């Protein structure tokens, strides 16, 4: 029942998911790798710090477009039609990946701060205007922002699932560590067993660096010794 070719299916399936659009490089091309490419960017409270590994946005063009004929003249674009109701464009700098809808909706991935999505973004929406569309950019929002860390020391998973149950799982089909649900902020935290953190779901920085300052001393009380 499910038809990604539907293109309120394939919009509605970026932000669906089980961690949300953590998941967006499922469409733009496995559960395991999508996580650990997060832990790997040319970085990852005692010194430790987070850093932004992706934010995802969206931009509305304000105009229904043809995405055959963007899909034609823009350089680095894919429209499989079967497989996703969307051209799938890249830009270099910033090195980013949109996806755009007949409608006009817009979503860009990839960029590491919020500047860069949101010029990104215009990058985009100006690409589409030279084609020959009635495009505008507007209503830009940053939906999603994830963040990794590493608090650098080995952590007791078995006893964090258990000590804090209530605010975890212990789901392996989904994650081989541990996801931790946090309620203030709302924030998803994906916890390995050897101190390596994503945290996703943020719509603020802030928020990221909120869920960390409040994990760091439940973790430390888990290291593994």
Same mark, same amino acid.
Request: some cysteine; overall charge positive.
């Given at each position: 029942?499910?038809?990604?070719?539907? +293109?309120?299916?394939?919009?509605?399936?970026?932000?669906?998911?089980?961690?949300?659009? $953590?998941?967006?490089?499922?469409?733009?091309?496995?559960?395991?790798?999508?996580?650990?490419?997060?832990?790997?960017?040319?970085?990852?409270?005692?010194?430790?710090?987070?850093?932004?590994?992706?934010?995802?946005?969206?931009?509305?063009?304000?105009?229904?477009?043809?995405?055959?004929?963007?899909?034609?003249?823009?350089?680095?674009?894919?429209?499989?039609?079967?497989?996703?109701?969307?051209?799938?464009?890249?830009?270099?700098?910033?090195?980013?990946?949109?996806?755009?809808?007949?409608?006009?909706?817009?979503?860009?991935?990839?960029?590491?701060?919020?500047?860069?999505?949101?010029?990104?973004?215009?990058?985009?929406?100006?690409?589409?205007?030279?084609?020959?569309?009635?495009?505008?950019?507007?209503?830009?929002?940053?939906?999603?922002?994830?963040?990794?860390?590493?608090?650098?020391?080995?952590?007791?998973? +078995?006893?964090?699932?258990?000590?804090?149950?209530?605010?975890?799982?212990?789901?392996?089909?989904?994650?081989?560590?541990?996801?931790?649900?946090?309620?203030?902020?709302?924030?998803? $935290?994906?916890?390995?067993?050897?101190?390596?953190?994503?945290?996703?779901?943020?719509?603020?920085?802030? +928020?990221?660096?909120?869920?960390?300052?409040?994990?760091?001393?439940? $973790?430390?009380?888990?290291?593994?010794?």
């Amino acid at each position: 029942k499910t038809n990604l070719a539907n +293109e309120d299916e394939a919009y509605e399936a970026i932000f669906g998911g089980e961690f949300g659009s $953590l998941e967006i490089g499922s469409y733009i091309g496995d559960q395991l790798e999508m996580v650990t490419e997060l832990l790997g960017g040319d970085m990852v409270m005692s010194g430790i710090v987070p850093t932004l590994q992706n934010i995802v946005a969206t931009v509305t063009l304000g105009c229904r477009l043809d995405l055959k004929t963007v899909a034609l003249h823009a350089r680095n674009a894919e429209y499989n039609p079967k497989r996703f109701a969307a051209v799938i464009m890249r830009i270099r700098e910033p090195k980013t990946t949109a996806l755009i809808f007949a409608s006009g909706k817009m979503v860009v991935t990839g960029a590491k701060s919020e500047d860069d999505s949101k010029l990104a973004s215009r990058k985009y929406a100006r690409i589409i205007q030279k084609i020959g569309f009635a495009a505008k950019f507007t209503d830009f929002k940053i939906q999603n922002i994830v963040g990794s860390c590493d608090v650098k020391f080995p952590i007791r998973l +078995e006893g964090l699932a258990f000590s804090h149950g209530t605010f975890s799982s212990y789901e392996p089909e989904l994650f081989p560590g541990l996801i931790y649900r946090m309620v203030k902020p709302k924030i998803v $935290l994906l916890i390995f067993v050897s101190g390596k953190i994503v945290l996703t779901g943020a719509k603020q920085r802030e +928020e990221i660096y909120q869920a960390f300052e409040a994990i760091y001393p439940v $973790l430390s009380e888990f290291r593994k010794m």
